[PDB]
Design a protein around this ligand. Structure first.
Ligand SMILES: [Mg+2]
Ligand SMILES: [Mg+2]
Ligand SMILES: [Mg+2]
Ligand SMILES: [Mg+2]
Ligand SMILES: [Mg+2]
Ligand SMILES: [Mg+2]
Ligand SMILES: [Mg+2]
Ligand SMILES: [Mg+2]
Ligand SMILES: [Mg+2]
Ligand SMILES: [Mg+2]
Ligand SMILES: [Mg+2]
Ligand SMILES: [Mg+2]
Ligand SMILES: [Mg+2]
Ligand SMILES: [Mg+2]
Ligand SMILES: [Mg+2]
Ligand SMILES: [Mg+2]
Ligand SMILES: [Mg+2]
Ligand SMILES: [Mg+2]
Ligand SMILES: [Mg+2]
Ligand SMILES: [Mg+2]
Ligand SMILES: [Mg+2]
Ligand SMILES: [Mg+2]
Ligand SMILES: [Mg+2]
Ligand SMILES: [Mg+2]
Ligand SMILES: [Mg+2]
Lengths: 30, 151, 100, 262, 205
RNA sequence: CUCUCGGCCGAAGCGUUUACUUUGAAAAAA
RNA sequence: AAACUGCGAAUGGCUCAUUAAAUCAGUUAUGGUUCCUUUGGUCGCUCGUACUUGGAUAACUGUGGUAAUUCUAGAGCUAAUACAUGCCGACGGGCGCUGACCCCCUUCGCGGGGGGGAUGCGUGCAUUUAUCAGUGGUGACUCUAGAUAACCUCGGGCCGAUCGCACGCCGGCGGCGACGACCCAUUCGAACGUCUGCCCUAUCAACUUUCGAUGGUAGUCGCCGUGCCUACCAUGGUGACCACGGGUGACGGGGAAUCAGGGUUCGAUUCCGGAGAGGGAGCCUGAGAAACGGCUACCACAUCCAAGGAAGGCAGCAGGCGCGCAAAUU
């Protein structure tokens, strides 16, 4: 259970950080 | 201003003052870094606290105290203790039988930081509630405003 | 072996009291001559000292070695040691059993 | 008083239980649990006073000891178990499901839900903290802590929990325009769209909420529970759709029902 | 027994306060743990909530940190030389918080000689018995010797600490509470704090 | 009340501070 | 049945003696603490006989002592989720440090740069200290998490030697539960604080401070913030806006009687809070008493006694005496 939860949260965190980085790029563009 | 007047050594606990320094970076003294915090509720940190050298563990800006709860105001009445003053709070108490008020007051002993210099008998102080600092002190002076006819 | 006894008023004999007479002790759980009624209770009780004198009702003695003669009703019979061992390890020890 | 208190005087019980005065001196005294004592509905009150499945406390005990009552999918044999807001009570033997939802007059209504809707619930998030090798943790109003939550989930948000597994399925962020229910105070039980939230640092934050009929009311931030995203609730609402009628229109409605009866 | 209540005290106006209840268990106090220097003796206290306080009665070993070098070692507590609160505490050799103590310097010297490959606190007789000659000079590859030579450029100790190392005993401040945690930990004095306490100790005698 | 921020508004101060008056919230049951 | 173990006995009931900014009420705070239990999380994260460990003791059986108690002694057995003790496994490694050696690179070369590595020490969460950098959070942390060097109490911290019901599959794996457990959160609280509010009395006008009064520094103790206590300092702190002292036929509120309006008086009394268990004091156990249907003393009463000793606490329900104008069934 620990291993599976950690892997799933790693995937979700990667997606969330990618979206945040894209928004930061949009901000720095403007 | 010498800050070592007690039997023990006065020092801000958070700051480490014995960091190794090479002789190439020995331009006099290292200008000992100052610990200070920004208390919230829209109160500015006095420049004295940032650029000072006093040691005051009860200071709201450089000591270990948290401002929480009630924020009150008073007039300074006495400044005869070390780092703490006596302020006066006046109010009117309503009496319903007569539909009329009566003037009342109560004194409060509040801690005054060394960051507030040139405090005179008569100015207004905004104090904020904190944990018990002594037997009778539960407030810390957060702001000082001069009297109406100061120089 | 002098195992214990009672004085002329029924008060028991304690082991660590080096007196000829009676004393009062604050006895607690884990002490002889005391049975606590609730958890953490201690009681002040009278106890006779550990030194044997003439002021005793009964003296409890234990045979530790046997002579050559047999006391009529003390060293001839036997008791069939009811309630043998219960823990498996104790059974194995008693019957010299192996692990298998 | 040394140590904790174990009794509850009947007249000192919370008023929304709707307990009478002459039945006895005492009240059920909810057990310690996920919901606060003043804001819960004990199992005995619901099973006996509300649903009339039992006539006495002993009958409630007899019901619960056959393991028929499930609270959020788990069998609960404690008759004073505190069941609170958004809890799901399932009775499979008779085959019904209820959700504890505040009525307009601040009382837990008997609200029957479909078995499809009894598989999940909504929980307000109370705090988020990082612990134990940088693992985030959520704490809900139901006292359940969930590790590895979505990084977007912040305090005062709402999460949909699958009762079978206990994991988050989706969430609603606390923002203006989202539907909410008031879970405490004078406006308890009222449903409306959040209009504005004013912040008072060091003090309580006030949230303004507008009904579907245009009425507005304020509450404290701790009394707000996000129910749906936008105008649409994520759960089924009780018969009163969360709007409060004044005593005049309530009397008019009662009179109209009386006239139409017969 | 011992009490810590605020109601036996006078009011801020100086008037007497008449008690409205008798002494409560949660206001209790306990006799002080006047921790001495000697072979370890620690007693445990069952405190409120069922938790445990460790009451150190005798201590001879502490965990002390050299902050400038970040070298924490378990050393032997030797003597008490200063106490800012009372002088009888120095006279009776009592370990309390913020008490100035003399700690053995051997582990720190060992770490210094193993980490910098430079002698510390040594006399001019230059005995350097084997296994110390090895630890000080040794033979190393070019990379290892280069790393040690890089280290040697920023290995200079203050003169006061060098004198103390020559004597074999360092001055340290106890940052723990022996009467509450059963431990006498702290940090080696250096910098302006060392100068302050040296001046105070000299003026005391 | 205006100069700045974010999507004409939402934000920010501060208009010397209040008292007063009106509203809102929080306020055991009996 | 009994007995050991576990839990409760700290709730409830009674009464109103004490108590005059005390209690209590409304409002706030704990970013200054403790918390049995319920509920959720965590519980191969640690690189170091197990197909099961050891010694007792009760119940029970037998000898007893004392005038006398819910007094207990000696002897003979025997259990554990009581007392202790203590592995395997996951386990292959990873990660810090170490760095014998080996390789590549450049540079004639030197030298510089970049790698791989044997051998050693350490390692997880709790604890104590010091240092470094700045995942999530707050109005505000010296918060949360992270990194490093160590520590880790013999009066020891966690890392399951426990029970029940169904039984199974592939030679080993397993489904439901119940107990237990460090830590975090939650519930029930509790404990200190903040702000405002109390009757009469000046035939009580100055009080506190040498034995803490007010504040500062360092500590001790405490669950923690604090003159709570200690050492050294400073001379402060309250008052005609009534301090301090005295009185009360004063437990405080929600409330009650009367009342056009305004008021006056009552509130021991079933809900909330406080206090006490003849009067003081001190403690054990426990998550929680300074508990009295727990214990230890002294003071006042008082019971049995074979005179050596033993046992007490109805302001619990009934009931008796006494007091009274004044109040019910063993
Ligand atoms: Mg009670
Ligand atoms: Mg707050
Ligand atoms: Mg604990
Ligand atoms: Mg009311
Ligand atoms: Mg028992
Ligand atoms: Mg229990
Ligand atoms: Mg108990
Ligand atoms: Mg649990
Ligand atoms: Mg025996
Ligand atoms: Mg202090
Ligand atoms: Mg002080
Ligand atoms: Mg003193
Ligand atoms: Mg009275
Ligand atoms: Mg009254
Ligand atoms: Mg009364
Ligand atoms: Mg009376
Ligand atoms: Mg009461
Ligand atoms: Mg009591
Ligand atoms: Mg009496
Ligand atoms: Mg008592
Ligand atoms: Mg009684
Ligand atoms: Mg009682
Ligand atoms: Mg009676
Ligand atoms: Mg008569
Ligand atoms: Mg009558």
């Amino acid at each position: 259970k620990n291993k599976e939860e950690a892997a799933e949260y790693a995937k979700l965190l990667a997606k969330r950080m990618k979206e945040a980085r894209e928004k930061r790029q949009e901000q720095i563009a403007k | 201003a010498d800050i070592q007047t007690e039997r023990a050594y006065q020092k801000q606990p958070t700051i480490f003052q014995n960091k190794k320094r090479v002789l190439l970076g020995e331009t006099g003294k290292e200008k000992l870094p100052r610990y200070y915090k920004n208390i919230g509720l829209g109160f500015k940190t006095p420049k004295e606290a940032i650029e000072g050298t006093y040691i005051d563990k009860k200071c709201p800006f450089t000591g270990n105290v948290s401002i929480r709860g009630r924020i009150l105001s008073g007039v300074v009445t006495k400044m005869k203790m070390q780092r703490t003053i006596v302020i006066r709070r006046d109010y009117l108490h309503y009496i319903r039988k007569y539909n009329r008020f009566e003037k009342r007051h109560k004194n409060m002993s509040v801690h005054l930081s060394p960051c507030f210099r040139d405090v005179q008998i008569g100015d207004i102080v905004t104090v904020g509630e904190c944990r018990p600092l002594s037997k009778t002190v539960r407030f810390n002076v957060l702001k000082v405003t001069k009297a109406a006819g100061t120089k | 072996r002098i195992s214990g006894g009672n004085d002329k008023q029924g008060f028991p004999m304690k082991q660590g009291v080096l007196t000829h007479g009676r004393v009062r002790l604050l006895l607690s759980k884990g002490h002889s001559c005391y049975r606590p009624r609730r958890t953490g209770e201690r009681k002040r009780k009278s106890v006779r000292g550990c030194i044997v004198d003439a002021n005793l009702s009964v003296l409890n003695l234990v045979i530790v070695k046997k002579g050559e003669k047999d006391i009529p009703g003390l060293t001839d019979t036997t008791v069939p040691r009811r309630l043998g061992p219960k823990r498996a390890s104790r059974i194995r020890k008693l019957f010299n059993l192996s692990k298998e | 008083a040394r140590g904790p208190k174990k009794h509850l005087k009947r007249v000192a019980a919370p008023k929304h239980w709707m307990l009478d005065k002459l039945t006895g001196v005492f009240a059920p005294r909810p057990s310690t649990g996920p919901h606060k004592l003043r804001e819960c509905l004990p199992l005995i009150i619901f099973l006996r006073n509300r649903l009339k499945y039992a006539l006495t406390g002993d009958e409630v005990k007899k019901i619960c000891m056959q393991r028929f009552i499930k609270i959020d999918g788990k069998v609960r044999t404690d008759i004073t178990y505190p069941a609170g807001f958004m809890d799901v009570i399932s009775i499979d033997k008779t085959g019904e499901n209820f959700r504890l939802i505040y009525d307009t007059k601040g009382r837990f209504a008997v609200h029957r839900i479909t078995p499809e809707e009894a598989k999940y619930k909504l929980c307000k998030v109370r705090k988020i903290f990082v612990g134990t090798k940088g693992i985030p943790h959520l704490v809900t109003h139901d006292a359940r802590t969930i590790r590895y939550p979505d990084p977007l989930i912040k305090v005062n948000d709402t999460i949909q929990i699958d009762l079978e597994t206990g994991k988050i399925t989706d969430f609603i962020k606390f923002d203006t325009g989202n539907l909410c229910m008031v879970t405490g105070g004078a406006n308890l039980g009222r449903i409306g769209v959040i209009t504005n939230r004013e912040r008072h640092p060091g003090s309580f934050d006030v949230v303004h909420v507008k009904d579907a009929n245009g009425n507005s009311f304020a509450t404290r931030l701790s009394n707000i529970f996000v129910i749906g995203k936008g105008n649409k609730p994520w759960i089924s609402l009780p018969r009163g759709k969360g709007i409060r009628l004044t005593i005049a229109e309530e009397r008019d409605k009662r009179l109209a029902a009386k006239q139409s009866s017969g | 027994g011992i009490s810590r209540d605020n109601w036996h005290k006078r009011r801020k106006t100086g008037g007497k306060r008449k008690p409205y209840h008798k002494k409560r268990k949660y206001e209790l106090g306990r006799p002080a743990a006047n921790t001495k220097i000697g072979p370890r003796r620690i007693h445990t206290v069952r405190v409120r909530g069922g938790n445990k306080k460790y009451r150190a009665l005798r201590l001879d070993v502490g965990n002390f940190s050299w902050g400038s070098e970040c070298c924490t070692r378990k050393t032997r507590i030797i003597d008490v030389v200063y106490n800012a609160s009372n002088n009888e505490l120095v006279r009776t050799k009592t370990l309390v918080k913020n008490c100035i103590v003399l700690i053995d310097s051997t582990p720190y010297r060992q770490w210094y000689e193993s980490h910098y490959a430079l002698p510390l606190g040594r006399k001019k007789g230059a005995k350097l018995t084997p296994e110390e000659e090895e630890i000080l000079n040794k033979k190393r590859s070019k990379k290892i010797q280069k790393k040690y030579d890089e280290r040697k450029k920023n290995a200079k100790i203050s003169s006061l600490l060098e004198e103390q190392f020559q004597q074999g005993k360092l001055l340290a401040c106890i940052a723990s509470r022996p009467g509450q945690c059963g431990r006498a930990d702290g940090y080696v004095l250096e910098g302006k704090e060392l100068e302050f306490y040296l001046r105070k100790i000299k003026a005391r005698k």
